[PDB]
């Protein structure tokens, strides 16, 4: 999963759409934190000055050694529309902070006209208030329910609304009468992926289908920034949220990012998953959500000290399990079991990462246990798949002079129907579907003679 | 593929003080990190035989024969079950407990006592002896017309039928118990044999001998011990402990000399009287009493009379000591029964490192030689520094394309010869020789084919020893390599025997894995590679290289070797590329030279 | 995780003269600039922490110890507590003939121990950089020099950088403190524009300061005057017993009252 980091989605947006996102004060604070220190300090410097500042002055402030680093940050600011060029009468061109972005940062920094994103009329004690540890358990259970659809367990209690999102996401595909759920190869890789990265990918999929729903993309993004900074101890009010946000909150309950005591309740409790959600892997060798429970051995014996149906299913896909016990689960990384994971569709690096992420503390700091000897064998199996390539290829004959064949090769290469140049053998690798266009070019070559 | 024993064993929250998991199948898992593991491991060795010994977790499976050995020790049935409960994370299954009860119900279902060199069978209960007599085969082989005996019934048993009786006892589920009484053998004369106080004794060897003696009279047992690493010392020390004339059988002629050499330093009795049946020395055989023989190989029928008849007769009368067996896996099946017929021993001792003998699941001679009393830990030996921590690297070389086309075309043994003679594999061996030459460490190369090593040696101008060579010429080259301090590459065949020297050398290269004797190759790795210095440091001067031809299915043996390696504790790695074999000047680098090699193998008759 | 501690030397007599002058810059404006700088420091990094201390003539008071306007709740609360503390201290003052000048050294000593207790509270695994910003409008005191020197040594031992900006006149004690610590020393020509100077040099983190170009700290001269006749000497004899500078060699040393041994 590419890490947006509040940059990739912002990049390529229309300037007015970026200004609409900058309309919320909370989003501007999140963007300010996202900005690198050199850019962030400069935005603070230009925050108090209305006058545009010339490029020559901008070059002067940074040292010549650090000027190259500043140019990359300046490019990010221009793409985000935080900095917009202003043409001065003099040759030097002034750079001025975006007014909507500047005003909202000023509203967060000092008193402003806006009343803030969240307002509470007067709520203190909450009936059936959710405990912080119970919130953490609820968040883990709800995410397991989303995953468990890709297991077929009775614990998969999706609200059907989540199931429709899963089909739109493509992690789970329903085919045949009765729409029975099936796991896509991408879905198996998604299960292997860490939970914070999984949440971020799901949010991007929600944004893609948000346009069909009609929910505003900027409003959903603003709520996501609030979720990242949300504190379990703090409580937030459902009232003061738009109807699209209320629908998003109901979907958030299915994700487990947000816990609602009641759908119509005017108070909602932030959940651990929302704070955990981020565009990054939780750890290379550690998981914030779960302490490592998998023991990794060069012998290929794996012991799991935590008993969960979802965890057992994930371990089973990469490695078949010889024995099952509640205290410890015995699993072997057989060559056949890894081959079954490849047939389902999985990343070999992801399997190593999954074992390292849940590796036991005794296993950590030991060089041999982290990489199994089977990984060399997995590369050899991948090489066998790489060796054999299948595509349909039409065949052309009587090419005669090589120069005429080369002219056809250039047309075929542009089409992409050509698999190989094959200049000497003079046998076309053009696909049958694209053969008609290549044949038309070949006939034109015959006419030119 | 998943077995749930959660129903079989009740779950109890006692995992901190317990390192063992007990299951109905009898498979048990031991945590090496836990402190309680050392006590658990000793209990596991006595009641169970390990299918595998991974360093991180020890795997032990309960065996009826191993349990019977514990019953022979005299451990109480309640105590064995109680020890399992003490070390069990989850409650012990009732069915496994019932299996333990049946094995420990009687210490010996049938008890065998040697009196006046006669195998009398004595039973506390007359009905049990009557049940043994019921079998028709036992009646046919029963000896007829040949003391505080309260509640004792004794019937004489033919020495020849004793081996048959053991097989019949397994059929009747009435296993024999080996008991020897020195007072009962009045005819045998007591003699004094003492190990030299100056001579050092390894601790593991002393512990194994102490266990074999057990309580009172010595009890027959088989001890797994390193071969070529103090292996001779354990047997000679055992002979001193018995204080009775004893015979050592070694298939290798060189091994017999090594056993004698160890015996000579500690005992000054040998200087006054020395007799060797091997080599037909026959020096004062009656007076010396102790003799050295090679199973039934030494005996010749119709080739010689007078002296040969006397040599066979003298061994039985002069030596009444427990039989000593070496390289049992190398020995063919039923050879031990033939030796038992020629000379009868009250107890049987086996000293071979390999867990499995003869590499046959269907046929095992373990029942004939008795249960395995103790197994040496190879990892412990590496910590001691008696044996080097061998590093095993597998080098994979692609089969030559011209060679492969011939290999698929013919299913004859010539195709196996083509796989053994792989030019890329030869280049990898030559590069390894160059790498060892830079180190200056002594290097040995072994090829499964007898002439394959010789052909490579002729190309590299290196000395070669093969099975069809004069023993004296082969020994002289071995003396130059070890006794003389010189560094050279020597190509060695199996030669039909195992050769080891007092000077210790390390490093071996395996050209091919197609050899029929898989256990012999596994033994060769331990015997050839030895610690450069006593108490060797963690850094190892011992490097083992295996050359594998790709697409010849040589990997299948390599997978079997890994199971042997985990028990050894030897470090294991695989290198697909030597990362410099191609960037070196080696013979057969050119494809045309490889084609010439292919033509020569095809020209040679299958 | 960067700790910025701001210490301002406030003299009611000096600030009162500024109020009598009726200049646009005021004591109220100076505190407002400090609060805006503090809000910016907290805004750039949530981990970064701000502590504000004001020095009265005879005492030192620590000013630092919702979103009504949409301003961040933490920033609004921090400013409110400081506003109550500053007004209470400034409105009531006690006139002392002996001490008409506020003690910067006493405030600095309190700040250094406060940083030390906070550093102990901070987890060892997380790393905190501690820096001190000093704004001085009061005149330097010769008597306070002995106390001032010890606080500079405490900052050097604790490796806390001291950065000082002087609104009207450079202070020899203050410039020496910056030189020993290695912290940047700056003089602000325009008192109303002080906030802009604070943002450019004082606000950036030490890593950010190296990347940007900032005016170099003024070189500090070293002056040795004998306390005997309060007179500066290029070469001064120093007595071994009392370590006191002497303009000329003395057979009997007055500072320790011992007589120098003569061979
Ligand atoms: Zn003095």
- Chain B residues with CB-CB distance to A323 below 8 A: 2-5, 23
Nearest CA in chain A to B59: A301
DSSP letters along A208-273, please?
Answer: HHHHHHT--HHHHHHHHHHHHH--SSS-EESTT--HHHHHHHHHHHHHTSEE-S-SS-SEEEE-HH
| Of B204, B161, B154, B210, residue with least CA distance to B179 | B154
> Is B229 a known ligand-binding residue?
yes
DSSP letters along B504-520, please?
Answer: ----EEE--S--S-HHH
| Of B439, B368, B300, B348, residue with least CA distance to B114 | B348
Cα–Cα distance measured from residue A429 to residue A9, given in angstroms and rounded to the nearest whole number: 39
Do A350 and A323 touch, CB atoms closer than 8 A?
no
Name, in order, each residue with C-beta under 8 angstroms of B227's C-beta and a sequence gap of 6 or more. Answer: B326, B327, B351, B352, B353, B498, B500, B523, B526, B527
- Chain A residues with CB-CB distance to C70 below 8 A: 25, 107-108, 111-116
Cα–Cα distance measured from residue B145 to residue B138, given in angstroms and rounded to the nearest whole number: 16
Cα–Cα distance measured from residue B579 to residue B266, given in angstroms and rounded to the nearest whole number: 51
- Chain A residues with CB-CB distance to C197 below 8 A: none
Cα–Cα distance measured from residue A301 to residue A161, given in angstroms and rounded to the nearest whole number: 40
Cα–Cα distance measured from residue B531 to residue A435, given in angstroms and rounded to the nearest whole number: 70
Do B523 and B372 touch, CB atoms closer than 8 A?
no
Do B462 and B491 touch, CB atoms closer than 8 A?
yes
Burial class (CB in 10 A: 0-12, 13-18, 19+), B126: exposed
Q: Which helix (H) or strand (E) holds C106?
A: helix C104-121
Q: What's the resolution in A?
A: 4.1
Residue B142 carries which DSSP code?
Answer: B
Sign of the Cα pseudo-torsion (B168, B174, B175, B177, in order): negative
CB atoms within 10 A of CB B117: 16
Residue A97 dihedral angles phi and psi, to the nearest 5°? -65, 145
Cα–Cα distance measured from residue B490 to residue B443, given in angstroms and rounded to the nearest whole number: 7
Determine the distance separating the centroid of ligand 1 and the alpha carbon of C99, expressed in angstroms.
Answer: 30
Cα–Cα distance measured from residue A421 to residue A413, given in angstroms and rounded to the nearest whole number: 8
Cα–Cα distance measured from residue A26 to residue A236, given in angstroms and rounded to the nearest whole number: 14
Instruction: List alpha helices for B12-158, DSSP H.
Output: 37-47, 64-73, 77-87, 94-104, 126-134, 136-141
Do B263 and B270 touch, CB atoms closer than 8 A?
yes
Residue C118 dihedral angles phi and psi, to the nearest 5°? -65, -40
Which residue of A66, A69, A112 is in closest CB contact with C69?
A112
> Is B226 a known ligand-binding residue?
yes
Do B513 and B562 touch, CB atoms closer than 8 A?
no
Cα–Cα distance measured from residue B350 to residue A249, given in angstroms and rounded to the nearest whole number: 76
Sign of the Cα pseudo-torsion (C83, C84, C90, C91, in order): positive
> Is B225 a known ligand-binding residue?
yes
Distances (CA, A) of B209 to B67, B231, B366: 20, 13, 19
Q: What is the 3-state secondary structure (H, E, C) of B61-94?
A: EECHHHHHHHHHHCCCHHHHHHHHHHHECCCCCH
Three-state SS at C50: strand
CA distance B262 to chain A (A): 39
Cα–Cα distance measured from residue C131 to residue C2, given in angstroms and rounded to the nearest whole number: 8
Residue A364 carries which DSSP code?
Answer: T
CB atoms within 10 A of CB B508: 23
Asked if B5 and A328 come within 8 Å (Cβ–Cβ), the reply is no
Which residue of A62, A66, A112 is in closest CB contact with C70?
A112
Tokens 């325009």 belong to C190
C32–A contact, CB cutoff 8 A: no
CB atoms within 10 A of CB A386: 9
Name, in order, each residue with C-beta under 8 angstroms of B256's C-beta and a sequence gap of 6 or more. Answer: B248, B250, B276, B278, B292, B294
Determine the distance separating the centroid of ligand 1 and the alpha carbon of C260, expressed in angstroms.
Answer: 8
Cα B158 to chain centroid distance, Å, stands at 30
Cα C122 to chain centroid distance, Å, stands at 24
Burial class (CB in 10 A: 0-12, 13-18, 19+), C247: middle
Tokens for B232, please give them: 């001779």
Interaxial angle between packed helices A25-34 and A37-47, expressed in degrees from 0 to 180 and rounded to the nearest 10: 140
CA dihedral B549, B553, B554, B560 (to 10 degrees): 150
Tokens 């300090």 belong to A41
Cα–Cα distance measured from residue B37 to residue B20, given in angstroms and rounded to the nearest whole number: 8
Do B9 and B91 touch, CB atoms closer than 8 A?
yes
- Chain B residues with CB-CB distance to A325 below 8 A: 4-6, 21, 90
For chain C, what is the total number of helices (H) and then of strands (E)? 8, 10
Bridge partners, B575 (sequence order): B395
Residue B460 dihedral angles phi and psi, to the nearest 5°? -95, 5
A228–C contact, CB cutoff 8 A: no
Do B373 and B208 touch, CB atoms closer than 8 A?
yes
Residue of A313, A323, A326, A376 to mutate for B, most B C-beta atoms under 10 A: A323
Determine the distance separating the centroid of ligand 1 and the alpha carbon of B160, expressed in angstroms.
Answer: 114
Do chains C and B touch by CB distance (3+ pairs < 8 Å)?
no
Instruction: List alpha helices for A48-126, DSSP H.
Output: 55-61, 64-80, 99-109
Asked if B2 and A321 come within 8 Å (Cβ–Cβ), the reply is yes
Do chains A and B touch by CB distance (3+ pairs < 8 Å)?
yes
| Of A113, A112, A117, A105, residue with least CA distance to A226 | A117
Do B312 and B274 touch, CB atoms closer than 8 A?
no
Nearest CA in chain A to B16: A327
Do A37 and C185 touch, CB atoms closer than 8 A?
no
Tokens for B249, please give them: 């059988």
DSSP letters along C181-229, please?
Answer: HT--EEE-S-STTHHHHIIIIISS-HHHHHHB--PPPPP-----EETTT
Tokens for A63, please give them: 């040292």
Q: What is the 3-state secondary structure (H, E, C) of B396-442?
A: EEECCHHHHHHHHHCCCHHHHHHHHCCHHHHHHHHHHHHHHHHHCCC
Tokens for B416, please give them: 């196996």
Three-state SS at C108: helix
| Of C84, C62, C47, C45, residue with least CA distance to C5 | C62
> HSE (CB half, 13 Å, CA atoms) of C212?
23
The two beta strands, B292-293 and B248-249, are parallel
Residue A129 carries which DSSP code?
Answer: P
């Amino acid at each position: 999963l590419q890490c947006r980091n509040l940059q990739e989605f912002l990049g390529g947006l229309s300037p007015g759409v970026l200004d609409r996102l900058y309309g919320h004060p909370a989003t501007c604070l999140a963007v300010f934190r996202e900005l690198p220190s050199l850019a962030k300090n400069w935005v603070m410097r230009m925050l108090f000055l209305e006058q545009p500042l010339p490029q020559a002055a901008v070059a002067l402030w940074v040292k010549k050694e650090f000027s190259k680093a500043q140019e990359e940050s300046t490019g990010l600011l221009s793409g985000l529309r935080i900095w917009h060029t202003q043409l001065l009468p003099g040759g030097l061109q002034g750079l001025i902070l975006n007014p909507i972005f500047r005003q909202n940062l000023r509203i967060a920094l000092l008193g402003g006209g806006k009343a803030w994103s969240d307002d509470t009329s007067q709520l203190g004690p909450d009936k059936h208030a959710r405990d912080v540890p119970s919130l953490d358990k609820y968040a883990e259970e709800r995410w397991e329910v989303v995953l468990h659809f890709m297991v077929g367990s009775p614990s998969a209690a999706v609200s059907q609304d989540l199931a429709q999102l899963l089909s739109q996401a493509g992690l789970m595909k329903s085919t045949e009468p009765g729409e029975p759920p099936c796991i896509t190869s991408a879905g198996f890789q998604f299960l292997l992926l860490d939970t914070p990265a999984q949440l971020w990918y799901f949010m991007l999929q929600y944004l893609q289908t948000a346009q069909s729903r009609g929910m505003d993309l900027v409003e959903i993004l603003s709520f996501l920034f609030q979720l990242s900074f949300s504190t379990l101890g703090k409580d937030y009010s459902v009232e003061g949220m738009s109807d699209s946000l209320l629908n998003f909150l109901q979907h958030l309950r299915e994700f487990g990012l947000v816990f609602q005591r009641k759908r119509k309740s005017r108070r909602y409790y932030p959940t651990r998953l929302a704070i955990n959600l981020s565009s990054g892997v939780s750890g290379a060798g550690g998981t914030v959500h779960q302490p490592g429970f998998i023991v990794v051995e060069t012998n290929y014996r794996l012991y799991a000290y935590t008993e969960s149906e979802l965890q057992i299913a994930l371990i089973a896909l990469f490695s078949e399990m010889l024995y099952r016990f509640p205290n410890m689960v015995v699993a072997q990384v057989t060559r056949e079991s890894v081959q079954q994971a490849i047939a389902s569709g999985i990343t070999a690096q992801q399997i190593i990462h999954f074992l390292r992420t849940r590796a036991h503390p005794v296993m950590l700091k030991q060089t041999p246990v982290l990489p199994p000897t089977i990984t060399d064998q997995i590369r050899l199996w991948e090489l066998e798949r790489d060796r054999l390539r299948f595509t349909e290829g039409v065949l052309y004959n009587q090419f005669l002079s090589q120069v005429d064949f080369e002219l056809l090769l250039a047309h075929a290469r542009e089409l992409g129907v050509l698999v190989f140049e094959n200049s000497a053998k003079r046998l076309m690798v053009v696909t049958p579907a694209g053969h008609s266009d290549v044949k038309r070019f070949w006939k034109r070559q015959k006419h030119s003679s | 593929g998943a077995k749930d024993y959660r129903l079989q064993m009740p779950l109890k929250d006692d995992h901190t003080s317990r390192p063992l998991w007990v299951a109905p199948d009898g498979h048990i898992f031991l945590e090496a990190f836990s402190p309680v593991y050392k006590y658990a491991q000793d209990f596991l060795v006595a009641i169970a035989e390990p299918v595998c010994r991974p360093t991180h977790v020890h795997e032990y499976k309960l065996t009826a024969y191993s349990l019977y050995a514990a019953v022979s020790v005299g451990l109480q049935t309640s105590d064995i079950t109680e020890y399992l409960r003490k070390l069990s994370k989850t409650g012990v299954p009732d069915g496994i407990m019932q299996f333990i009860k049946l094995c420990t119900v009687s210490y010996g279902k049938v008890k065998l006592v040697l009196k006046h060199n006669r195998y009398f069978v004595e039973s506390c209960h007359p009905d049990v002896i009557q049940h043994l007599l019921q079998d028709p085969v036992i009646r046919e082989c029963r000896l007829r017309n040949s003391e505080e005996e309260t509640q004792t019934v004794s019937f004489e048993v033919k020495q020849e039928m004793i081996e048959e009786l053991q097989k019949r006892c397994i059929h009747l589920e009435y296993p024999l118990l080996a008991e020897y009484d020195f007072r009962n053998d009045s005819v045998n004369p007591d003699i004094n044999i003492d190990l030299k106080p100056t001579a050092v004794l390894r601790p593991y060897q002393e512990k194994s001998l102490r266990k074999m003696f057990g309580n009172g009279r010595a009890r027959s047992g088989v001890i797994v011990l390193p071969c070529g690493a103090g292996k001779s010392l354990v047997g000679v020390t055992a002979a001193c402990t018995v204080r009775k004339r004893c015979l050592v059988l070694g298939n290798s002629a060189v091994s017999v000399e090594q056993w004698k050499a160890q015996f000579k330093m500690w005992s000054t009795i040998d200087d006054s009287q020395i007799c060797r049946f091997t080599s037909d020395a026959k020096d004062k055989p009656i007076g010396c009493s102790v003799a050295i023989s090679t199973y039934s190989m030494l005996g010749h029928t119709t080739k010689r009379s007078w002296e040969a008849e006397r040599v066979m007769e003298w061994l039985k009368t002069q030596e009444w000591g427990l039989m000593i067996l070496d390289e049992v896996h190398t020995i063919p099946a039923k050879m031990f029964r033939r030796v038992l017929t020629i000379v009868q021993a009250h107890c049987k001792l086996g000293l071979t490192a390999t867990l499995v003998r003869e590499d046959d699941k269907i046929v095992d001679l373990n029942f004939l030689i008795g249960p395995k009393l103790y197994e040496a830990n190879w990892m412990e030996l590496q910590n001691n520094g008696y044996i080097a921590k061998v590093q095993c690297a597998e080098v994979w070389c692609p089969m030559s394309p011209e060679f492969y086309r011939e290999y698929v075309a013919i299913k004859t043994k010539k195709r196996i010869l083509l796989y053994t003679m792989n030019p890329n594999k030869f280049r990898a061996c030559q590069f390894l020789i160059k790498f060892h030459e830079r180190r200056n460490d002594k290097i040995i190369v072994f090829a499964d084919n007898v002439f394959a090593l010789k052909e490579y040696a002729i190309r590299l101008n290196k000395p070669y020893i093969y099975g069809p060579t004069s023993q004296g010429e082969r020994m002289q080259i071995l003396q130059n390599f070890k006794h003389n301090p010189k560094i050279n590459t020597i190509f060695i065949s199996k030669v039909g025997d195992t050769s080891f020297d007092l000077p210790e050398a390390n490093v071996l290269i395996q050209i091919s894995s197609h050899g029929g004797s898989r256990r012999q190759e596994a033994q060769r790795l331990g015997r050839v590679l030895r610690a450069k210095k006593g108490m060797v440091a963690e850094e190892y001067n011992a490097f083992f290289y295996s050359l594998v031809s790709q697409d010849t299915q040589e990997m299948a043996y390599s997978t079997k070797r890994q199971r042997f390696l985990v028990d050894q504790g030897y470090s294991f790695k695989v290198i697909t590329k030597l990362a410099g074999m191609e960037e070196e000047d080696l013979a057969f680098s050119t494809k045309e030279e490889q084609q010439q090699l292919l033509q020569k193998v095809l020209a040679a008759t299958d | 995780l960067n700790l910025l501690v701001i210490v301002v030397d406030a003299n009611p007599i000096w600030w009162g003269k500024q109020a009598l002058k009726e200049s646009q810059f005021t004591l109220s404006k100076c505190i407002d600039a400090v609060m805006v700088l503090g809000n910016s420091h907290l805004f750039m990094n949530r981990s970064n922490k701000l502590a504000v201390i004001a020095s009265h003539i005879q005492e030192s008071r620590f000013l630092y110890p919702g979103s009504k306007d949409g301003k961040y709740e933490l920033l609004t609360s921090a400013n409110e507590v400081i506003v109550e503390e500053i007004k209470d201290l400034m409105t009531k003052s006690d006139i002392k003939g002996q001490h008409t000048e506020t003690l910067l050294a006493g405030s600095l000593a309190k700040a250094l121990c406060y940083i030390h207790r906070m550093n102990k509270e901070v987890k060892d695994n997380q790393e905190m950089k501690s820096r001190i910003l000093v704004i001085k409008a009061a005149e330097d005191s010769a008597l306070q020099y002995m106390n001032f020197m010890n606080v500079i040594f405490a900052a050097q031992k604790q490796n806390i950088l001291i950065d000082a900006c002087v609104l009207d006149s450079d202070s020899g004690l203050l410039q020496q403190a910056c030189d020993i610590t290695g912290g940047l020393y700056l003089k602000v020509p325009q008192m109303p524009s002080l906030l802009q100077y604070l943002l450019w040099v004082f606000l950036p983190d030490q890593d950010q300061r190296s990347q940007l170009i900032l005016p170099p700290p003024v070189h500090v001269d070293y002056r040795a005057a004998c306390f005997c006749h309060r007179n500066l000497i290029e070469i001064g004899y120093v007595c071994s017993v009392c370590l006191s500078i002497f303009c000329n060699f003395s057979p009997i040393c007055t500072t320790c009252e011992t007589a120098f041994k003569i061979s």
